[PDB]
Each structure stands twice: as structure tokens, then as C-alpha cells.
């Protein structure tokens, strides 16, 4: 019968879904392989042909995904990095491309691009900026107090490392430059970009096991210095809101620090000009150090939960017939 045959095509589909779901269960206990930050929105639709229908992972632009396994050339297995989100099927760049083409063909100018995923560290590295320039006593003493608090508050979960190399250079215009200039600089084994590239791979490796990564980055005084990299940092703005208060603080450190007053005041003003919601992930402008520490810890504990979801319950073997 023609009906009994559609029953076969449906049963084949159900068996394919059962096998895909079984592979999803096996991945629940595998480690996070890598992470990506998205550049586009993906809203799961009814014709997406997901390996298990209804288990597609929808996401917004600039979301973060933890990837555990490659299912096939069209789908990965992973989860949105967000509390309460469980693993499902993430469309690959190959699949994301073909879906956009289908959307444009059914859409209603006279003449009728960007990669959706960037590989980023599995944990977003924490970077402190402000109140002024690093290397001077006011900023160094304030950031050191926050670093000392993070060591104790997150002991056993934290990996703090110093970065003296200018990781602001770790962008495509520098590290992936195709001009005949770079082709010659890559020939010298002592090109300054070698240590920059090496430091980036070390930061990725430090976050692979999902520990909280905190960078003491010497050269990063402004979020625009990392926005073009693939480090996707958590930018913590240590803020002194009153320029006059910052002046007394700098002047209170002696003439050695009062000499470089203008360069410190200018940098603090540059941070104040940043649109806060696009530039900073955490803004610490509390009056007391203890209150600023609690704010930062609250944020990182929430990030820890988003990156360390509880283990899913295993099916009770008592319910099995054999």
C-alpha cells in the first residue's frame, strides 16, 4: 500500500532521529572542545532539517556557544553559554550559509558575507582597564587589590597570568595580513608577531578546561584595544568617576607620579567617553573596595554557573526490562 510506504519513510525518519538523539546523550559527558562567538542571529525554523527536530540551538548575535562534538558537516553538538541552556544541535557555517540562501529566494533592488562564527577561548579572559594608565601607582595599586581578591575568592577555580606582550596586535589586520610585507616578516624567526601569536595560543590553552582565566595585560588600557581580537574578553572597568578625585589620588603619590599627571588624566577621560553598554562587561564604580569586589565576584560566579551547568540526570536502570 502507498500508505504503508509513507509509514516506512516516517519510520526511517524516526530511526534517524533516535540515532541522532542517542549521539546527543553520549556527548553530554564529553568535554567542551572549543567555543565560538556568533556574529549573526539564528532562529530555528520548521524546515531547518535538524537531526532531532526541536533540539536546534537558537542564538543571537554576539552570543557564546560551547561546542562538544561534530555531528556531521551541517550540525555540531553544543550549548548556548547561558544558565539553564542544555546541549542541542548547532548549525555549522556550511548549514548556516544554505539557510540564508533559502531565505533570500522566498523573500519578496535592481542588482539582485561575514562569517557567522569566531573561535574564541572557552572561557572569556577577564581584563581590567582603568581608572587610568597601567604602570602608574594609582591604577597598579587598585588593580593589584582586585587581583589579590580574585586569587582568594576563586582559589582552585582561577588561573591568573601576566601578559607583557601587546595582545592588541592579535587582529586579522596584523596576524592574518596577506600583503607582501607580512610574507617577508613571517620569514624572520624573530618577527615580533611570533611572541604575540604564541601568547594568544597560550591564553586559549589556559581556558580549555573551563577554569576562570584572568589576564594581567600590561598593554591593554582601553576596550577598543581588544575589540578587534578573537579573545572576547570580559572587560572590567575600574572607574574613578570624578576627574578631580583622580587628580588628588595621583598627586598623593608624590612628584614622581604627579609628573605624568596629564597622560594619566587623558586616559581616564578616554574611558569616560566610551559608550558603556558596548564597551564594558562590568563597571566597578563603588565607593568601597569591598563593595567593588563583591560586584565583580557576583558577576564571575554567575559566569561560572553559565559555563559549568549541572550534570544531566542519567536514566534509572530500574525502568529497563532487561
Amino acid at each position, epitope marked *: 500500500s502507498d500508505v504503508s510506504l509513507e509509514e516506512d519513510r516516517e519510520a526511517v525518519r524516526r530511526e534517524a532521529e533516535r540515532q541522532a538523539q542517542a549521539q546527543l546523550e553520549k556527548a553530554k559527558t564529553k568535554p567542551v572542545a572549543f567555543a565560538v562567538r556568533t556574529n549573526v542571529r539564528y532562529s530555528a525554523a520548521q524546515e531547518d532539517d535538524v537531526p532531532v527536530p526541536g533540539m536546534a540551538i537558537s542564538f543571537e548575535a554576539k552570543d557564546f556557544l560551547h561546542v562538544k562534538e*561534530k555531528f556531521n558537516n551541517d550540525w555540531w553538538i553544543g550549548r548556548l553559554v547561558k544558565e539553564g541552556c542544555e546541549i542541542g544541535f548547532i548549525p555549522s557555517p556550511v548549514k548556516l550559509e544554505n539557510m540564508r540562501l533559502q531565505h533570500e529566494q522566498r523573500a519578496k533592488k535592481r542588482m539582485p558575507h*561575514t*562569517p557567522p562564527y569566531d573561535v574564541v577561548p572557552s572561557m572569556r579572559p577577564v581584563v581590567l582597564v582603568g581608572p587610568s594608565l597601567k604602570g602608574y601607582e594609582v591604577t597598579d595599586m587598585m588593580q593589584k587589590a582586585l587581583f589579590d581578591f580574585l586569587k582568594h575568592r576563586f582559589e582552585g577555580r582561577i588561573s591568573i597570568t601576566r601578559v607583557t606582550a601587546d595582545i592588541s596586535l592579535a587582529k586579522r589586520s596584523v596576524l*592574518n595580513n*596577506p600583503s607582501k610585507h607580512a*610574507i617577508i616578516e613571517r620569514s624572520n624567526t624573530r618577527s615580533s608577531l611570533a611572541e604575540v601569536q604564541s601568547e594568544i595560543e597560550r591564553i586559549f590553552e589556559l581556558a580549555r578546561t573551563l577554569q576562570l582565566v584572568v589576564l594581567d595585560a600590561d598593554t591593554i588600557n582601553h576596550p577598543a584595544q581588544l575589540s578587534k581580537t*578573537s579573545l572576547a574578553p570580559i572587560i572590567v572597568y575600574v572607574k574613578i568617576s570624578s576627574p578631580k578625585v583622580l587628580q588628588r589620588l595621583i598627586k598623593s603619590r608624590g612628584k614622581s607620579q604627579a609628573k605624568h599627571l596629564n597622560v594619566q588624566m587623558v586616559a581616564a577621560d578616554k574611558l569616560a567617553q566610551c559608550p558603556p553598554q558596548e564597551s564594558f562587561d562590568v563597571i566597578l564604580d563603588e565607593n568601597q573596595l569591598e563593595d567593588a569586589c563583591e560586584h565583580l565576584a557576583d558577576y564571575l560566579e554567575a559566569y561560572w554557573k553559565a559555563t559549568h551547568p549541572p550534570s544531566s540526570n542519567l536514566p534509572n536502570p530500574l525502568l529497563s526490562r532487561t
Partner: nanobody, 121 residues
Framework: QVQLQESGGGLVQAGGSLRLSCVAS????????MGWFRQAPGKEREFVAA????????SHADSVKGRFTISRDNAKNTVYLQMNSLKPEDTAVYYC???????????????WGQGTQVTVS
């Protein structure tokens, strides 16, 4: 995509600065992460370097960090492996492979090239 031609180069004794180059067909090059592998005359294929879709992230093998550097031009559908300071341990056939995934594993790559021979004495 389905066709990967690795221009590359020949062999040297030591030192050296060879810019291997693999060209791809089709306007889906930006949809694939690109990696370089190598197979010594008597050894298994091993990972050398990989670069992601937009070219913003690169990973190099421990045996090759600093000496070799991968890059890509998505306007020319090409990927390179700048090889500097060459050693006998670098004698291998160099393969370039595309993946819809981020990986350093041979099984998780979707398309593979023909291969380019290099030798260091």
C-alpha cells in the same frame, strides 16, 4: 571546497623560507576552517596548523610553534603555511584540508588536497 590544489614547493637542506599555498574552488571558502597536515614517508598524518573561518584565530602544533605560520585570504580562496628554519624532522608530504568544524583531527575534516612533498636533509 571540493577541489584543493596545494602549490607549495620542493625540498631544502636547512633554514629555508617556503610559502606553501593551497587554492580552493567554489564561493564557499569562507564557510570552511582550513588546516595543514603532514605525513612523513613512514609515519602517520599529523596536524601542523589551522586557521578559522574569518582568519581571526590560528593554532599551530607544538613541534612547529614559532617556525611555521598559517594564514588565509578569503578574497583569493587561498591558505598558506610560511615555513621557516627547516629540519630533517620536517620531511613529509604536506596536505591541506577543509573542515566545517574546528579541529586538529584528520577524521573531522571534510575535503582534502592532493599533497606537496618537502624534504630537509
Amino acid at each position: 571546497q571540493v577541489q584543493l590544489q596545494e602549490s607549495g614547493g620542493g625540498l631544502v637542506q636547512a633554514g629555508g623560507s617556503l610559502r606553501l599555498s593551497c587554492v580552493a574552488s567554489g564561493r564557499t571558502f569562507s564557510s570552511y576552517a582550513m588546516g595543514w597536515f603532514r605525513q612523513a614517508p613512514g609515519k602517520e598524518r599529523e596536524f601542523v596548523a589551522a586557521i578559522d573561518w574569518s582568519g581571526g584565530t590560528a593554532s599551530h602544533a607544538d613541534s612547529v610553534k614559532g617556525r611555521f605560520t598559517i594564514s588565509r585570504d578569503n578574497a583569493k580562496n587561498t591558505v598558506y603555511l610560511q615555513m621557516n628554519s627547516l629540519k630533517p624532522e620536517d620531511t613529509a608530504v604536506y596536505y591541506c584540508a577543509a573542515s566545517s568544524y574546528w579541529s586538529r583531527s584528520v577524521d573531522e575534516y571534510d575535503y582534502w588536497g592532493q599533497g606537496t612533498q618537502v624534504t630537509v636533509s
